[PDB]
Swiss-Prot record:
Gene Ontology MF, one: N-acetyl-gamma-glutamyl-phosphate reductase activity
Catalysed reactions listed for this entry: N-acetyl-L-glutamate 5-semialdehyde + phosphate + NADP(+) = N-acetyl-L-glutamyl 5-phosphate + NADPH + H(+)
Gene this chain is encoded by: argC
Name this protein carries in UniProt: N-acetyl-gamma-glutamyl-phosphate reductase
Organism: Mycobacterium tuberculosis (strain ATCC 25618 / H37Rv)
Highest taxon above the source species: Bacteria
Length: 347
């Protein structure tokens, strides 16, 4: 059990960095003095105050953003990396080795070098314990870890929706995922196609037909629960919301619905963040915003011989920062649910 942890956040001015800070402010270790918020770093934002970026985080508004450098990041027991991929290997190498390093990007997520290279165009750096505690065998690798690779947002929703059925061998291993997402998932770098005037009142699929980099990440998590050949058709759709992922996940099945439901019960009955919808209810992203919860319902389309699983998460909490803090709690030997509410902020 960690006694006193001074935390830095690299990429503090971005959405993921902002959300880590929000959750750390609400964490009971912050309140009782055991967790201390240190250096807040970025690139070009350095020299500005945090309030200029995250006006919702008023207790920290006056903090001056510092450059993202080893000298600034030194002397922290834990360092969150909330930066675009391709910096954390370089950066992680510069930090004291015993630092708990929690990487929100993709660099340490994937376990196959040829898959990595294909989708990311660089040499594979390797892999770190995957920050999705609810996956079979995941929680054990996170306890006492000094290294965490936080999952992508879409794979979190897809894996939670699909792994129990596939693990029980109750569906075919060719899965289809169509997931809608709020725009905060795309980050805070200004581009035309993320402007409000463009996104408000409009929906669009993007990176379709296997080009999205989260495709192999879904396939990897699934391959860990079955011996069968997994395929993934993944289509992300940007919708006019700031937060939220609703993943619609399908696969061929000939199994009774009651057996599929039993597989979800077994997987999730004692998982505090997973909420199985009551009969006749279905998830909505509105219900999970600002919580670390995933709300899940499953069904069978008999005419179509198709299993349907719906999963809703907050992309910034269970999809990113909440996953990071949940995994942090595990790494430090603190109660896993600390700082992480299952109650949504709705309407
Ligand atoms: N947002 C999500 O829903 C989500 C979900 C899953 C994973 N992630 C991951 O989180 C990471 C950041 O995403 P985001 O959505 O939070 O992006 P973002 O909102 O654009 O913020 C990016 C942050 O990184 C900083 N940065 C950029 N280049 C840097 C550099 N060369 N050195 C140091 N800092 C640099 C920026 O600083 P400046 O302000 O100075 O530019 C900013 O603080 C990505 O790897 C992404 O894959 C995000």
């Amino acid at each position: 059990v960690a006694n006193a942890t001074k935390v830095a956040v690299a990429g503090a001015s971005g959405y993921a960095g902002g959300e880590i800070l929000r959750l750390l402010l609400g964490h009971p270790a912050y309140a009782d003095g055991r967790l201390r918020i240190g250096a807040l770093t970025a690139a070009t934002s350095a020299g500005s105050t945090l309030g200029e970026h995250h006006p919702h985080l008023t207790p920290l508004a006056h903090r001056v953003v510092e450059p993202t450098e080893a000298a600034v990041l030194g002397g922290h027991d834990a360092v969150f990396l909330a930066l675009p991929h391709g910096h954390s290997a370089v950066l992680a190498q510069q930090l004291s080795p015993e630092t708990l390093i929690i990487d929100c990007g993709a660099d340490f997520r994937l376990t196959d070098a040829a898959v990595w290279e294909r989708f990311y165009g660089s040499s594979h750096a390797g892999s770190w314990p995957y920050g999705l505690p609810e996956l079979p065998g995941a929680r054990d690798q996170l306890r006492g870890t000094r290294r965490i690779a936080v999952p992508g947002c879409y794979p979190t929703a897809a894996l939670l929706a699909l792994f129990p059925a596939l693990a029980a061998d109750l569906i075919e291993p060719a899965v289809t995922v169509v997931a809608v997402s709020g725009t905060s998932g795309a980050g805070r770098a200004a581009t035309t196609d993320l402007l409000g005037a463009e996104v408000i009142g409009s929906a669009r699929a993007y990176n379709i037909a296997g080009v999205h980099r989260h495709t192999p990440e879904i396939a990897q998590g699934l391959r860990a629960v079955t011996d069968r050949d997994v395929s993934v058709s993944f289509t992300p759709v940007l919708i006019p919301a700031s937060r939220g992922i609703l993943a619609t996940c399908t696969a061929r099945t000939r199994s009774p619905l009651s057996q599929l439901r039993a597989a979800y019960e077994k997987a999730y009955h004692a998982e505090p963040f997973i909420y199985l919808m009551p009969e006749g209810q279905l998830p909505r992203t509105g219900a999970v915003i600002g919580s670390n919860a995933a709300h899940i319902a499953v069904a069978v389309d008999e005419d179509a011989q198709t299993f349907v699983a719906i999963a809703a998460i907050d992309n910034l909490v269970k999809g990113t920062a909440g996953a990071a803090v949940q995994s942090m709690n595990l790494a430090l030997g603190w109660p896993e649910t600390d700082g992480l509410s299952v109650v949504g902020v709705a309407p």
